Amino acid sequence: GPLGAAGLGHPAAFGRATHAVVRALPESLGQHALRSAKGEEVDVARAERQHQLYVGVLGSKLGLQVVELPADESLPDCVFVEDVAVVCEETALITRPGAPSRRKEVDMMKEALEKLQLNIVEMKDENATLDGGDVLFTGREFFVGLSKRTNQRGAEILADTFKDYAVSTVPVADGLHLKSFCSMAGPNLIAIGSSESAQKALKIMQQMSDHRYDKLTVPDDIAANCIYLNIPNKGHVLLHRTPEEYPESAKVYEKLKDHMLIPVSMSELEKVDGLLTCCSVLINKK
Amino acid sequence: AFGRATHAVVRALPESLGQHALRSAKGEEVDVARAERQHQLYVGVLGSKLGLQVVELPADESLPDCVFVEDVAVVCEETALITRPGAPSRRKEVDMMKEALEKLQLNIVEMKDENATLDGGDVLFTGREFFVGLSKRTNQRGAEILADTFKDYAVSTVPVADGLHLKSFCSMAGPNLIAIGSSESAQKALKIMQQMSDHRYDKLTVPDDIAANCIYLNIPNKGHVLLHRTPEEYPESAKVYEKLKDHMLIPVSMSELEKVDGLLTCCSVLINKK
Numbered sequence: 432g433p434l435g436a437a438g439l440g441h442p443a444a445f446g447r448a449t450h451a452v453v454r455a456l457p458e459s460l461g462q463h464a465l466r467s468a469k470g471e472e473v474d475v476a477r478a479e480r481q482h483q484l485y486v487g488v489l490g491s492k493l494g495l496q497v498v499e500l501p502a503d504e505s506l507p508d509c510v511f512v513e514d515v516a517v518v519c520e521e522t523a524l525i526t527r528p529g530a531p532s533r534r535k536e537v538d539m540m541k542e543a544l545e546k547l548q549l550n551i552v553e554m555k556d557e558n559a560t561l562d563g564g565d566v567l568f569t570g571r572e573f574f575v576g577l578s579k580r581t582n583q584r585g586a587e588i589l590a591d592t593f594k595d596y597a598v599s600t601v602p603v604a605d606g607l608h609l610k611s612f613c614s615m616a617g618p619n620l621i622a623i624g625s626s627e628s629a630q631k632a633l634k635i636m637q638q639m640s641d642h643r644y645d646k647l648t649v650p651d652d653i654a655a656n657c658i659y660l661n662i663p664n665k666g667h668v669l670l671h672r673t674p675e676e677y678p679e680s681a682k683v684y685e686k687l688k689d690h691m692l693i694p695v696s697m698s699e700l701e702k703v704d705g706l707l708t709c710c711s712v713l714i715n716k717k
Numbered sequence: 718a719f720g721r722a723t724h725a726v727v728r729a730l731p732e733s734l735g736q737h738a739l740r741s742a743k744g745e746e747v748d749v750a751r752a753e754r755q756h757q758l759y760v761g762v763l764g765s766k767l768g769l770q771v772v773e774l775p776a777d778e779s780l781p782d783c784v785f786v787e788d789v790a791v792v793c794e795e796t797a798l799i800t801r802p803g804a805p806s807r808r809k810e811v812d813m814m815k816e817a818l819e820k821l822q823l824n825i826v827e828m829k830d831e832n833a834t835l836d837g838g839d840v841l842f843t844g845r846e847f848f849v850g851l852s853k854r855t856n857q858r859g860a861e862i863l864a865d866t867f868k869d870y871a872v873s874t875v876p877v878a879d880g881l882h883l884k885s886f887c888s889m890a891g892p893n894l895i896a897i898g899s900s901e902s903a904q905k906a907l908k909i910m911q912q913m914s915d916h917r918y919d920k921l922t923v924p925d926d927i928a929a930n931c932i933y934l935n936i937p938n939k940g941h942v943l944l945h946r947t948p949e950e951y952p953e954s955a956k957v958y959e960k961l962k963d964h965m966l967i968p969v970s971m972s973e974l975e976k977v978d979g980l981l982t983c984c985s986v987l988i989n990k991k
């Protein structure tokens with residue numbers, strides 16, 4: 432196997448994926464999806480086009496094998512597959528979402544991950560809730576946001592499932608997920624917002640950790656949600672929000688001269704709090 | 718982190734071990750030269766291969782059992798309990814082990830109560846709590862003194878069948894992982910231990926009770942390390958250990974010292990110094 436830390440990537444590198452699971456959005460998303468704040472009307476056709484372009488980046492441009500689950504009109508939030516599963520190595524934790532009406536989304540995700548021959552562990556404890564959006568996996572450990580959607584028991588079950596990794600919790604403000612203001616932008620590199628709320632969470636995370644991470648600080652918390660991938664024969668890749676959406680944050684990502692930067696629009700789904708990480712579950716099948 | 722260690726205390730075996738060491742059953746003749754080579758290989762794993770600083774105490778021909786240092790001290794974090802062994806004739810071994818642990822700058826607590834006995838072989842430390850076997854060598858008062866010494870950790874007792882120590886059929890094989898034998902006795906003791914603790918331990922069950930005695934270490938730049946008995950000695954138990962794909966497995970022969978009931982944990986005291 433691999434030794435040392437050199438090179439631009441290999442089949443066991445941090446952020447390597449081979450597969451992605453996504454799910455189409457239903458027409459009912461526009462009116463019936465849950466959302467943290469009143470806001471502008473969702474253009475569902477535009478949201479569909481943006482989702483289609485995002486899937487095209489993962490599958491066509493970057494070469495992942497993409498499993499596209501069909502929309503369910505009775506599950507308006509079903510596009511946000513990250514909340515229903517957390518995958519680490521060959522094990523998939525099927526979560527118990529904090530919003531009870533999203534718990535129906537679990538079935539089809541579990542089916543897809545079984546077909547990919549992952550080891551399946553299910554949250555069934557009636558006292559446990561966990562949204563995948565509250566989970567930051569750094570490659571070395573997990574941080575789990577304690578929010579209105581994820582509680583202490585859910586974090587405990589995650590820690591029981593991925594026993595080989597440290598798990599620590601951090602309080603998250605109401606209406607937010609942990610990854611509403613952070614994500615990994617590269618090996619040992621955490622993208623983080625500049626708000627007092629985001630900085631308070633980062634401090635709690637870094638004081639719980641036995642490691643020192645580097646930071647990529649962006650002026651817009653929402654734009655700290657990005658997707659880092661290590662892609663064969665391409666190397667470090669970063670999907671990030673567009674200059675048209677967050678020009679001041681795009682200026683920061685543009686400094687990453689050793690990344691392949693891919694701007695990806697999410698402006699319509701953001702209206703129902705959908706960001707980049709929310710729309711896929713990434714899997715490394717070795 | 719569970720299983721961290723920086724130092725080990727061992728003691729050379731005397732020529733007198735062959736005929737004069739205590740043994741629970743008549744059996745084969747001990748090949749003392751072979752036992753010495755096996756002991757040297759064991760010490761080589763701890764010190765040279767794994768990088769522990771090993772304190773090697775000299776043999777005493779008048780103390781035929783002195784190689785079995787585990788029985789005379791229990792070390793938890795910065796505190797050493799110097800035990801009062803159940804076999805009176807082994808109580809002379811205490812002096813030199815106390816001296817060695819003093820030089821390692823440990824806090825020393827001595828079992829001196831004339832009503833108390835405890836062998837270190839009867840003590841299983843899981844990382845979360847202690848289980849203490851009540852055997853022919855370890856009694857209630859000894860276990861109470863251990864609980865008073867390690868006040869940060871829960872302690873519970875479990876009865877052990879005559880002629881055994883608790884770790885004659887169990888030991889820690891990793892974080893939250895108890896290696897355990899399959900005999901009536903072993904499974905009865907395991908059931909009592911689990912009934913006494915809320916914590917759910919994982920089990921590594923082996924068909925040979927003796928092969929459940931192993932040494933787990935967490936070594937920097939290596940990770941999980943496990944010293945276990947060889948396939949030549951216990952092939953059906955080695956097959957169970959070979960399944961631990963995230964452990965660095967180190968087979969270690971102890972066939973000669975097993976004739977005088979000496980297993981893997983018996984021959985060292987492990988210490989984590991910061």
Ligand SMILES: [Cl-]
Nearest residue numbers: 477480481696
């Ligand atoms: Cl667009």
Ligand SMILES: [Cl-]
Nearest residue numbers: 617618667689
């Ligand atoms: Cl990088």
Ligand SMILES: [Zn+2]
Nearest residue numbers: 564608706709
């Ligand atoms: Zn989300």
Ligand SMILES: [Zn+2]
Nearest residue numbers: 838882980983
């Ligand atoms: Zn012993």
